[PDB]
Design a binder for this molecule. Structure first.
Ligand SMILES: CNc1ccccc1C(=O)O[C@H]1[C@@H](O)[C@H](n2cnc3c(=O)[nH]c(N)nc32)O[C@@H]1COP(=O)(O)OP(=O)(O)OP(=O)(O)O
Ligand SMILES: CNc1ccccc1C(=O)O[C@H]1[C@@H](O)[C@H](n2cnc3c(=O)[nH]c(N)nc32)O[C@@H]1COP(=O)(O)OP(=O)(O)OP(=O)(O)O
Ligand SMILES: [Mn+2]
Ligand SMILES: [Mn+2]
Ligand SMILES: [Mn+2]
Ligand SMILES: [Mn+2]
Lengths: 224, 224
């Protein structure tokens, strides 16, 4: 029975390790509580980041669809290493778009700073990496902070997603960005300007907000 | 020892039941195994659908953020039962977006017809129901077909997903679609046209493909 008792726990360890990989800590437990209630938690202030590969579909002429997924897995493996180093939250991946959130599931007041350190690190990572044909991997990166709702929707193939205004403006900060830069709205610049160094881009038209003044994040302030 | 076995059996069962709903079973094993290969399998003939709710962010003015998440779970959970009815593959609910696939894991000659019957059924069920404020639920829908790659990318937050040209043009079919219509490209039209009624929209600009002749799925043909 020991040859089965040890194997049942070895299979439990593998199962728990997968669930852990796919879901944040508290979320996996909530989904095993066998609570019929839905997971929708309000968060007062979180920072969200989107990073998106510049001209990914043009690569479909020189690269096969399977090698493009092998590319994504390689590049995301490098980014996943970086999210663990910074202790942040990877939410999801939408093709060539990588979403990282700071301040969920465990809220933290320095969310903005931590994501800003992350974005600058991510910039240095992609800058060092080559696509399937030895060429560079250009990125558009945008951030935003604010009230968000995080939770799990649906009965199958579910994940912990986050919804809110800050995901909507961070999405625009990324799409409206010039390749190689980290774009932030006026609201985040206000949060960052004390510890970070930023360059004013100017006015920008948002797809659902209107017109905003934007800033580019270049690095931490010199400690001297 | 007696009470120890009683709880440990149940805990093992929670993880397995949770895990069962989270991924296709054989990909969960490939993920629990020590394989260094990319979980990426090529599939020839698959149809992909993208749905997205029209003006979701604006509903936050009348509905609380958590009731919006509860709504998304009520709405897409209803469609989750419709995918099963049609024997298709739900990929995810991301933001207010939904991805359903036809032709993975098992290939079916009617992959395009089965997903077209599903989208039309989905458009009828959405039309028959209200949002929490009592207003209608207008959707944008896009469909496409062709060779696809299905699997998992990255080392953290494993999620079973689908990539390819079909998922690229289905997302553009949805984003560029008029509200309440189901948009498909010329290639998809050419597949459906002998069992379904289609109306040409015409040549429209789509990102990464140029100018495409698009159509609107209207409904099934009168079998006399
Ligand atoms: C033959 N095409 C592919 C083969 C293998 C893997 C991916 C593709 C592919 O075309 O991926 C694209 C979308 O399907 C894929 N994609 C986007 N959203 C989703 C999504 O939500 N799900 C999946 N599975 N794939 C998605 O991302 C890719 C890039 O989309 P963007 O919209 O970001 O544009 P871009 O070419 O990079 O130029 P630009 O953005 O700088 O203007
Ligand atoms: C204050 N906003 C909210 C409060 C509670 C619940 C949801 C929201 C909200 O705005 O959710 C949006 C994103 O935060 C949330 N979201 C989560 N992840 C993502 C993501 O990766 N991308 C985007 N764009 N949005 C995301 O999805 C939601 C819908 O996004 P869309 O841009 O598709 O819809 P729309 O702009 O309302 O209308 P239309 O253009 O479709 O007509
Ligand atoms: Mn891109
Ligand atoms: Mn993208
Ligand atoms: Mn929407
Ligand atoms: Mn969306």
């Amino acid at each position: 029975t020991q040859r089965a008792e040890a194997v049942m726990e070895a299979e439990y360890e593998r199962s728990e390790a997968l669930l852990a990989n796919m879901l944040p800590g508290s979320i996996a437990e909530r989904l095993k509580s066998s609570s019929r209630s839905v997971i929708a938690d309000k968060y007062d202030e979180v920072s969200v980041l989107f990073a998106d590969i510049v001209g990914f579909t043009e690569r479909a002429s020189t690269t096969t669809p399977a090698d493009l997924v092998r590319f994504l897995n390689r590049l995301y493996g490098a980014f996943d290493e970086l999210v663990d180093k910074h202790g942040l939250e990877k939410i999801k991946v939408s093709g060539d778009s990588y979403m990282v959130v700071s301040g969920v599931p465990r809220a933290r007041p320095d969310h903005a700073f931590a994501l800003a350190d992350f974005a600058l690190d991510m910039a240095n990572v992609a800058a060092a990496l080559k696509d399937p044909h030895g060429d560079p991997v250009p990125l558009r990166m945008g951030m935003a902070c604010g009230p968000v709702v995080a939770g799990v929707v649906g009965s199958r193939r579910f994940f912990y997603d986050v919804w809110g205004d800050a995901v909507n403006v961070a999405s625009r900060m990324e799409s409206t960005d010039s390749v190689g830069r980290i774009q932030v709205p006026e609201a985040m610049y206000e949060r960052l300007k004390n510890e970070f160094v930023l360059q004013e881009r100017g006015r920008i038209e948002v797809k659902g907000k209107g017109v905003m003044r934007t800033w580019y994040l270049i690095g931490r302030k010199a400690d001297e």
